[PDB]
Design a protein around this motif. Structure first.
Motif, mmCIF file in Angstrom:
data_model
loop_
_atom_site.group_PDB
_atom_site.id
_atom_site.type_symbol
_atom_site.label_atom_id
_atom_site.label_comp_id
_atom_site.label_asym_id
_atom_site.label_seq_id
_atom_site.Cartn_x
_atom_site.Cartn_y
_atom_site.Cartn_z
ATOM 1 N N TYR A 24 11.609 -21.033 18.127
ATOM 2 C CA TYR A 24 10.816 -21.983 17.600
ATOM 3 C C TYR A 24 11.790 -22.545 16.570
ATOM 4 O O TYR A 24 11.589 -23.848 16.509
ATOM 5 N N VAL A 28 12.076 -26.196 17.820
ATOM 6 C CA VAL A 28 10.993 -27.350 17.097
ATOM 7 C C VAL A 28 11.476 -27.525 15.817
ATOM 8 O O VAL A 28 11.570 -28.706 15.476
ATOM 9 N N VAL A 29 11.911 -26.798 14.829
ATOM 10 C CA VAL A 29 12.079 -27.088 13.522
ATOM 11 C C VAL A 29 13.287 -27.844 13.525
ATOM 12 O O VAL A 29 13.442 -28.781 12.822
ATOM 13 N N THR A 32 13.447 -31.035 15.223
ATOM 14 C CA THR A 32 12.487 -32.255 14.592
ATOM 15 C C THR A 32 13.297 -32.754 13.448
ATOM 16 O O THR A 32 13.349 -33.927 13.354
ATOM 17 N N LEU A 115 8.224 -32.528 7.064
ATOM 18 C CA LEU A 115 8.100 -32.042 8.231
ATOM 19 C C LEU A 115 8.648 -30.503 8.627
ATOM 20 O O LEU A 115 7.758 -29.856 9.187
ATOM 21 N N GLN A 118 5.387 -28.606 7.621
ATOM 22 C CA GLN A 118 4.407 -28.685 8.759
ATOM 23 C C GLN A 118 4.686 -27.722 9.795
ATOM 24 O O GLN A 118 3.863 -26.962 10.375
ATOM 25 N N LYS A 119 6.052 -27.955 10.346
ATOM 26 C CA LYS A 119 6.371 -26.982 11.301
ATOM 27 C C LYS A 119 6.455 -25.539 10.859
ATOM 28 O O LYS A 119 5.973 -24.640 11.990
ATOM 29 N N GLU A 122 3.177 -23.753 11.217
ATOM 30 C CA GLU A 122 2.828 -23.630 12.641
ATOM 31 C C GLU A 122 3.719 -22.661 13.310
ATOM 32 O O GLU A 122 3.821 -22.382 14.435
#
Length: 127
Positions: A24, A28-29, A32, A115, A118-119, A122
């Protein structure tokens, strides 16, 4: 003044793991932040020669950047997600320590850090 050797991205003495949290952090991180319009100052180690910052490495002794993080993730350098999260936080903290509070680069770090937070909020549970 010269650049130091970059942070290590390869070390066969260091034990490694591939985990869903680390996956992830890459998928994702890192992805992004890397694609963001403000990513460019953070996509490689601070080049004190190119950027005319001869005092940067006098002040910053634990350098970190997203190019190094990207290599560490893609080349499975980490054991756990907290190591990688620490690298991101080191990168942001270095920027806020070295640069003047009104510099564009501080606003850029702040937008990327928003950002990031936020990631990380989660972050998936460990499998």
């Amino acid at each position: 003044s010269m650049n130091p050797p970059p942070p290590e991205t390869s070390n066969p003495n260091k034990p490694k793991r591939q985990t869903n949290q680390l996956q992830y952090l890459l998928r994702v991180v890192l992805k992004t932040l890397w694609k963001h319009q403000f990513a460019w100052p953070f996509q490689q180690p601070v080049d004190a020669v190119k950027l005319n910052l001869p005092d940067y490495y006098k002040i910053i002794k634990t350098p970190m950047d997203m190019g190094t993080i990207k290599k560490r993730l893609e080349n499975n350098y980490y054991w756990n997600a907290q190591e990688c999260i620490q690298d991101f936080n080191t990168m942001f903290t270095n920027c806020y320590i070295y640069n003047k509070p009104g510099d564009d680069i501080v606003l850029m770090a702040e937008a990327l850090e928003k950002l990031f937070l936020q990631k990380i909020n989660e972050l998936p549970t460990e499998e």
